[PDB]
Design an enzyme around this catalytic site. Structure first.
Site, PDB file in Angstrom:
ATOM      1  N   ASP A  30     -72.269  91.116  17.915  1.00 16.36           N
ATOM      2  CA  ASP A  30     -72.232  90.314  18.458  1.00 16.36           C
ATOM      3  C   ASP A  30     -72.646  88.873  17.741  1.00 16.36           C
ATOM      4  OD1 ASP A  30     -72.343  88.832  20.821  1.00 16.36           O
ATOM      5  OD2 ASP A  30     -74.565  88.469  21.281  1.00 16.36           O
TER       6      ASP A  30
ATOM      7  N   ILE B  52     -88.629  77.849  21.065  1.00 14.61           N
ATOM      8  CA  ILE B  52     -87.270  77.576  20.161  1.00 14.61           C
ATOM      9  C   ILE B  52     -86.113  78.124  20.933  1.00 14.61           C
ATOM     10  CG2 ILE B  52     -89.290  77.460  18.536  1.00 14.61           C
ATOM     11  CD1 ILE B  52     -88.283  79.973  16.952  1.00 14.61           C
ATOM     12  N   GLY B  53     -86.459  79.527  21.647  1.00 10.77           N
ATOM     13  CA  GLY B  53     -84.425  79.732  22.908  1.00 10.77           C
ATOM     14  C   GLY B  53     -84.597  81.121  22.809  1.00 10.77           C
TER      15      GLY B  53
ATOM     16  N   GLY C 296     -81.735  83.774  24.968  1.00  2.00           N
ATOM     17  CA  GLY C 296     -80.328  84.097  24.766  1.00  2.00           C
ATOM     18  C   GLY C 296     -80.639  85.607  25.829  1.00  2.00           C
ATOM     19  N   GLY C 297     -79.942  85.694  26.661  1.00  2.00           N
ATOM     20  CA  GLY C 297     -79.696  86.675  27.540  1.00  2.00           C
ATOM     21  C   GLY C 297     -80.953  87.105  28.043  1.00  2.00           C
TER      22      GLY C 297
ATOM     23  N   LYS D 136     -89.786  87.526  19.939  1.00  2.00           N
ATOM     24  CA  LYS D 136     -89.305  87.916  20.857  1.00  2.00           C
ATOM     25  C   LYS D 136     -89.636  88.880  21.897  1.00  2.00           C
ATOM     26  CE  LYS D 136     -84.219  90.160  21.330  1.00  2.00           C
ATOM     27  NZ  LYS D 136     -83.306  90.800  20.400  1.00  2.00           N
TER      28      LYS D 136
ATOM     29  N   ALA E 146     -84.092  87.705  26.676  1.00  2.00           N
ATOM     30  CA  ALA E 146     -85.205  87.877  25.586  1.00  2.00           C
ATOM     31  C   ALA E 146     -85.420  85.942  25.873  1.00  2.00           C
ATOM     32  CB  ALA E 146     -85.405  88.117  24.363  1.00  2.00           C
ATOM     33  N   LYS E 147     -86.719  85.572  25.877  1.00  2.00           N
ATOM     34  CA  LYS E 147     -87.303  84.369  24.767  1.00  2.00           C
ATOM     35  C   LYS E 147     -87.592  84.831  23.459  1.00  2.00           C
ATOM     36  CE  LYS E 147     -91.060  84.325  28.727  1.00  2.00           C
ATOM     37  NZ  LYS E 147     -91.451  83.381  29.461  1.00  2.00           N
TER      38      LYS E 147
HETATM   39  C1  KSA Z   1     -80.545  80.215  22.099  1.00  4.18           C
HETATM   40  O1  KSA Z   1     -80.460  81.327  21.373  1.00  4.18           O
HETATM   41  C2  KSA Z   1     -79.822  82.380  20.722  1.00  4.18           C
HETATM   42  O2  KSA Z   1     -79.150  83.259  21.295  1.00  4.18           O
HETATM   43  C3  KSA Z   1     -80.471  82.771  19.543  1.00  4.18           C
HETATM   44  O3  KSA Z   1     -80.713  83.554  19.137  1.00  4.18           O
HETATM   45  C4  KSA Z   1     -80.963  81.700  18.525  1.00  4.18           C
HETATM   46  C5  KSA Z   1     -82.459  81.081  19.109  1.00  4.18           C
HETATM   47  O4  KSA Z   1     -83.232  82.134  20.212  1.00  4.18           O
HETATM   48  C6  KSA Z   1     -82.228  83.448  20.011  1.00  4.18           C
HETATM   49  C7  KSA Z   1     -82.512  83.658  21.653  1.00  4.18           C
HETATM   50  N1  KSA Z   1     -83.029  83.868  18.994  1.00  4.18           N
HETATM   51  C8  KSA Z   1     -82.648  85.469  19.060  1.00  4.18           C
HETATM   52  C9  KSA Z   1     -82.865  86.221  20.096  1.00  4.18           C
HETATM   53  C10 KSA Z   1     -82.920  88.109  19.613  1.00  4.18           C
HETATM   54  C11 KSA Z   1     -83.964  88.331  18.466  1.00  4.18           C
HETATM   55  C12 KSA Z   1     -84.037  87.271  16.977  1.00  4.18           C
HETATM   56  C13 KSA Z   1     -83.843  85.889  17.835  1.00  4.18           C
HETATM   57  C14 KSA Z   1     -84.357  84.826  16.937  1.00  4.18           C
HETATM   58  C15 KSA Z   1     -84.941  84.307  15.668  1.00  4.18           C
HETATM   59  C16 KSA Z   1     -85.557  83.217  15.777  1.00  4.18           C
HETATM   60  C17 KSA Z   1     -85.054  81.660  16.454  1.00  4.18           C
HETATM   61  C18 KSA Z   1     -84.648  80.501  16.011  1.00  4.18           C
HETATM   62  C19 KSA Z   1     -84.836  79.227  15.204  1.00  4.18           C
HETATM   63  C20 KSA Z   1     -85.164  77.748  15.369  1.00  4.18           C
HETATM   64  C21 KSA Z   1     -84.457  77.894  15.711  1.00  4.18           C
HETATM   65  C22 KSA Z   1     -83.874  79.061  16.597  1.00  4.18           C
HETATM   66  C23 KSA Z   1     -84.238  79.860  17.742  1.00  4.18           C
HETATM   67  N2  KSA Z   1     -83.658  80.610  18.180  1.00  4.18           N
HETATM   68  C24 KSA Z   1     -84.240  81.938  17.049  1.00  4.18           C
HETATM   69  C25 KSA Z   1     -83.810  83.410  17.439  1.00  4.18           C
HETATM   70  C26 KSA Z   1     -85.612  82.932  14.043  1.00  4.18           C
HETATM   71  O5  KSA Z   1     -86.456  82.716  13.603  1.00  4.18           O
HETATM   72  N3  KSA Z   1     -86.738  84.437  13.758  1.00  4.18           N
HETATM   73  C27 KSA Z   1     -85.807  85.300  15.030  1.00  4.18           C
END
Ligand code: KSA
Ligand code: CL
Ligand code: NA
Ligand code: NA
Length: 315
Positions: free
Chosen positions: A131, A16-17, A19-20, A39, A22-23
């Site tokens: 951040d 679902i995403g 970020g640097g 994560k 982590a996935k």
């Molecule tokens: C690319 O988007 C991001 O940077 C996010 O912070 C945003 C994206 O992934 C990241 C990496 N992310 C994270 C980066 C670091 C820690 C937690 C997350 C994170 C979380 C969630 C979601 C999420 C839910 C639905 C759509 C996109 C989502 N993301 C997250 C979480 C979640 O539901 N619970 C934790």
């Protein structure tokens, strides 16, 4: 191999995403049927960062708040660290702002008081987030905001001038919240440029476009949050009851945790002991170790059912 450990307890769904370092994947916790966000980080890739991961994790263990995404489970394997988190199906504030173009002052307030709530609590617990941006704020099931991503707790577009200049963590989070406030109400950044040094220059100057739809009170608050000198910037204290913030509410931001861990929830304990066919007292004792292992995850996910008015029950 690494996934063998995780797949004992979770069915993994889609990414679902990313970020640097982590996935994050959607997943379901097999025992409770609850959806979660996992994560996933590789220990080997970015190995020198692993200390900032390890302290991100311990920070999250000391944060328990209605606007902070809950940590449930940490699993370390040979090559991976897996962090199981509360899943926020509403997605990123970022994408919400895109779809709406910008929020009205009324809706911005609703959203922004939640952000101030989360951050003031983070500070009350002795941390700075560092951040804060709309990718790090998610909407849960009830369309309430949840703050995530404590990897830098103790990008450029949200960074305060003093932090840029290597010179005050509280004050720097207020600046970032001012950038967020601006983006909510305007739908674009107050300081932006293709060239990073030119972006720096614009941040240091502190001058930004004031759009025609902003009210005078909004404009004042932005001015107070976006002071380049942190000594002149509004403090967190005065943000909590600022007149703009107080409009339509008439009480300051409620920042204290509403859901703090006091004593164990009898019904969750009882359900676990009954489900595991274990002595109730051993179960209490084992839950009380708070290892952030599968038993903690199960307990916390049962607590989450209770707080969403769902029956405390395992399958
Ligand atoms: C690319 O988007 C991001 O940077 C996010 O912070 C945003 C994206 O992934 C990241 C990496 N992310 C994270 C980066 C670091 C820690 C937690 C997350 C994170 C979380 C969630 C979601 C999420 C839910 C639905 C759509 C996109 C989502 N993301 C997250 C979480 C979640 O539901 N619970 C934790
Ligand atoms: Cl509030
Ligand atoms: Na513009
Ligand atoms: Na409060």
């Amino acid at each position: 191999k690494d996934y063998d450990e995780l797949l004992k307890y979770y069915e993994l769904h889609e990414t679902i995403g990313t970020g640097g370092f982590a996935k994050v994947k959607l997943a379901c916790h097999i025992l409770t049927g609850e959806m979660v966000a996992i994560k996933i980080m590789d220990k080997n890739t970015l190995g020198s960062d692993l200390p900032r991961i390890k302290t991100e994790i311990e920070a999250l263990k000391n944060l328990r708040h209605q606007h902070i995404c809950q940590l449930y489970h940490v699993l370390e394997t040979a090559n991976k660290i897996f962090m199981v988190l509360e899943y926020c199906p509403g997605g990123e504030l970022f994408d919400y702002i895109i779809s709406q173009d910008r929020l009205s002052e009324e809706e911005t307030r609703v959203v922004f008081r939640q952000i101030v709530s989360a951050v003031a609590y983070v500070h009350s617990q002795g941390y700075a987030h560092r951040d804060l941006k709309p990718e790090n704020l998610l909407f849960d099931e009830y369309h309430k905001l949840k703050l995530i991503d404590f990897g830098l707790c103790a990008s450029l577009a949200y960074a305060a001038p003093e932090l840029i200049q290597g010179k005050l963590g509280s004050e720097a989070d207020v600046w970032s919240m001012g950038i967020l406030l601006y983006v909510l109400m305007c739908g674009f950044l107050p300081f932006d440029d293709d060239n990073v040094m030119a972006l720096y220059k614009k941040i240091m100057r502190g001058k930004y476009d004031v759009p025609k739809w902003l009210s005078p009170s909004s404009i004042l608050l932005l001015q107070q949050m976006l002071q380049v000198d942190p000594k002149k910037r509004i403090s967190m204290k005065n943000l909590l009851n600022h007149p703009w913030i107080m409009q339509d509410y008439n009480y300051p931001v409620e920042w204290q945790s509403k859901n703090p861990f006091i004593h164990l929830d009898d019904d969750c304990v009882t359900e676990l002991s009954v489900h595991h066919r274990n002595n109730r007292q051993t179960m209490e004792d084992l839950i009380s170790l708070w290892q952030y292992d599968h038993l903690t995850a199960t307990y916390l996910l049962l607590l989450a059912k209770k707080a969403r008015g769902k029956p405390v029950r395992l399958r």
